[PDB]
Paper text:
To characterize the prefusion RSV F protein, the double mutant SC variant with the optimized apex (N67I, S215P: SC-DM) and the triple mutant variant with the extra substitution that reduced repulsion in the RR2 domain (N67I, S215P and E487Q: SC-TM) were purified and analysed. Structures of SC-TM (N67I, S215P and E487Q) and the processed variant with the optimized apex PR-DM (N67I, S215P) were determined to 2.4 and 2.3 Å, respectively. In the SC-TM structure, electron density for parts of the flexible loop that connects F2 and F1 was observed within the central cavity of the trimer. As the C terminus of F2 entered the trimeric cavity, electron density became weaker, and linker residues QARGSG could not be accurately placed due to the disorder. After this gap, density became better ordered, allowing linker residues in the turn (SGRS) to be accurately placed. In particular, the side chain of the Arg136 residue at the tip of the loop was well ordered and occupied a pocket formed by residues from its own protomer, as well as the fusion peptide of an adjacent protomer. Overall, the conformation adopted by the turn allowed residues in the fusion peptide to remain in the same favourable conformations as those observed in the processed structure. The third stabilizing mutation, E487Q, which was only present in the SC construct, does not result in a substantial change in side chain conformation. However, conformational changes are observed for Phe488 and Asp489, with the side chain of the former adopting a different rotamer in the SC-TM structure.
The RSV fusion glycoprotein (RSV F) is an attractive vaccine antigen, since it is the principal target of RSV neutralizing antibodies in human sera. RSV F fuses the viral and host cell membranes by irreversible protein refolding from the labile prefusion conformation to the stable postfusion conformation. RSV F contains two furin sites, which leads to three polypeptides: F2, p27 and F1, with the latter containing a hydrophobic fusion peptide at its N terminus.
Author numbering:
A (entry chain F): 27 to 105, 134 to 495
B (entry chain F): 27 to 105, 134 to 246
C (entry chain F), D (entry chain F): 446 to 495
E (entry chain F): 198 to 246
Write the structure that this text describes.
Amino acid sequence: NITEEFYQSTCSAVSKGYLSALRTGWYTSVITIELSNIKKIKCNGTDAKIKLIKQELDKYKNAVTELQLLMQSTPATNNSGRSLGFLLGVGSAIASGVAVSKVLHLEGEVNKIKSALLSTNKAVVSLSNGVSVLTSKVLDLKNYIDKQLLPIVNKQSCSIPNIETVIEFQQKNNRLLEITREFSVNAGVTTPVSTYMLTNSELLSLINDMPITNDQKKLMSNNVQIVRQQSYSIMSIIKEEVLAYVVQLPLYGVIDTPCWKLHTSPLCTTNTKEGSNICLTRTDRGWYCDNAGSVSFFPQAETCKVQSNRVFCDTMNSLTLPSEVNLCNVDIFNPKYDCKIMTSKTDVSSSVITSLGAIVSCYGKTKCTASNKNRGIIKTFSNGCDYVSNKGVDTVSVGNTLYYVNKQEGKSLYVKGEPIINFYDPLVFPSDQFDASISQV
Amino acid sequence: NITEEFYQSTCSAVSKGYLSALRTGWYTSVITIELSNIKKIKCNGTDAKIKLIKQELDKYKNAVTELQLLMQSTPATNNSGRSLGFLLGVGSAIASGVAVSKVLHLEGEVNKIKSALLSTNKAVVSLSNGVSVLTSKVLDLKNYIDKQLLPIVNKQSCSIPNIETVIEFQQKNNRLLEITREFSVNAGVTTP
Amino acid sequence: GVDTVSVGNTLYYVNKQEGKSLYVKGEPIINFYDPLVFPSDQFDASISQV
Amino acid sequence: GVDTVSVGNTLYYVNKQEGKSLYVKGEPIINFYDPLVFPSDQFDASISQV
Amino acid sequence: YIDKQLLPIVNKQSCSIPNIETVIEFQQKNNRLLEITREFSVNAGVTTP
Ligand SMILES: [Cl-]
Ligand SMILES: [Cl-]
Ligand SMILES: [Cl-]
Ligand SMILES: [Cl-]
């Protein structure tokens, strides 16, 4: 159950009650498509059905050629001031998948995988470097072409195939064309992993066969759409009648730990004289999750995805902070943690839509209200930082900007308190601390 | 007519003459596709045209199953120093649409919409919360499957369909597959 | 009359939209400040704050 | 010889690109500054500006 | 004709489904055999004209 508290003293709000799903590691599987090595199409027969097969077989060959050009390259990808995102480190997202992909280029490795998938479509292979991976065969075009399409290709006659075969081949070949299509506009690396790359059935099956915890299996299976978004597909090799690409799946080593979202907004004095005011803003906004005795902090919004009451985050875009970082919500002047803030003289009106309400920073001549769809305006905000819950409120207006509030169910608590900006003498207040803290000020 | 002035004193330039089109609010409509509830495909006939229909009908079922898994989740999305972007507030882009979506989960609301779109493909429905929305039916696979594909599915015979029907069904079903495709890689929320 | 502009190793194509430009001459305001007391560490500031 | 690096709760995989690294030893330059007069609010600065 | 055009659909469990034009063509070629047999069977093996 989601709850929320607004702190009038620091113009901020915390949303509690969430459960964690943090990607901590990676699992790499090798997906294969068995290809038919065919060059020639020996047939002088000008039959329309033969022509259609020839045309489809031509797309097949171009895809293979196109993929071979992609294989020649080494896979790579590249993954505000009121946020602490600049403090983050820089990881290499597909470094694990690429490491596996490089092994696949070694001679014998390809033939090793093909041997394992000879009788079955699912196997575990020991790679020459000494790493085991789940290998899977999702499509056998080699079988279909050699079994259904050989007499119309390998011979001058060329017994004209039925129309249903022409349709069927286009259906089966289509997946190869789409995979090639995605890789070719993404330089061999795609994310999220599409259903062309890995169908819902294949992914669910892969998850079940992943030797992970039953909780992780359940978690990933109920949130496949999120798993896809946190996954990469890496074109590896197309060699000796087999296309292979590495699918890099998220590993959730942290599950069901409490998470909370911190919302922040500018806190300024409200003197009538324009420009005689000083401002203060908490800069530690973002997602927080308890994690191994510390706290994983995610400054950027893109990093975390919320499903009902569970938060999916990526640890690569996080900081590991002392748990005392939470003290900034209760006592920003606490002696255990130096709470991060920024100062300014620019008192501009704005609103932050929270999980269960809205924070309004209203300054100057700005019209700031909250409304119900039926009644209309039910609250007019005064200058300063204020808050309203989503219960009974549908929209909030700050100036010419109308915000819809989240209609998530849950209780809000208004924690009254003197705005801390009132504690500072404007005559000696440093209003040029773009990245600062309580003690630094 | 566009004009422009450069101010040498402050190293800046202003381009005038433009007309506004500002998004100030949101309008939410409910788009519907009538689906045929089919499980079984009773037919032992190994005819190639039957096989193609079966395969296409299998994609249809997987799409439905895939969408049902997506429905289980609550929709959400996340929408330099020389710019003042850091001064901006933080809205919730799909808060209005999601609010409508939640109403649709309430029992009776679904049947209420289906009743309005019974005779027409365009109607306005009063939702139980007290909000009216334009509702639209853009595809009726329920009609097509039950009218063109029932004898080849509901019975052991299974009178083999013409090749043109096999083509036609793939054409109509394709849209459902693509919609499902977009939702599945976008966690149920797409834009544009 | 201009199609491109080059600054260092960077070539910019200009927009070929039709319309009149006006060059408003004026003393660069940076010349009004004494460098000895000029605060050059105001990342987010204003005229009065400087 | 290294495959991963862990900082706090964050596990980074390292690039397995082949190539030689050189560790150039040297006194951390932060040790050269007196903290009593060190400007720690220079968001965009330089050696001489500090 | 049978051994060249119709063997895979007869000699094997698969049975790669033949095109519709072959179905038509075989009926055309086979027809003559059926008619010859037809004439002989109502004429006790001797026909004239
Ligand atoms: Cl045919
Ligand atoms: Cl909105
Ligand atoms: Cl350019
Ligand atoms: Cl990593």
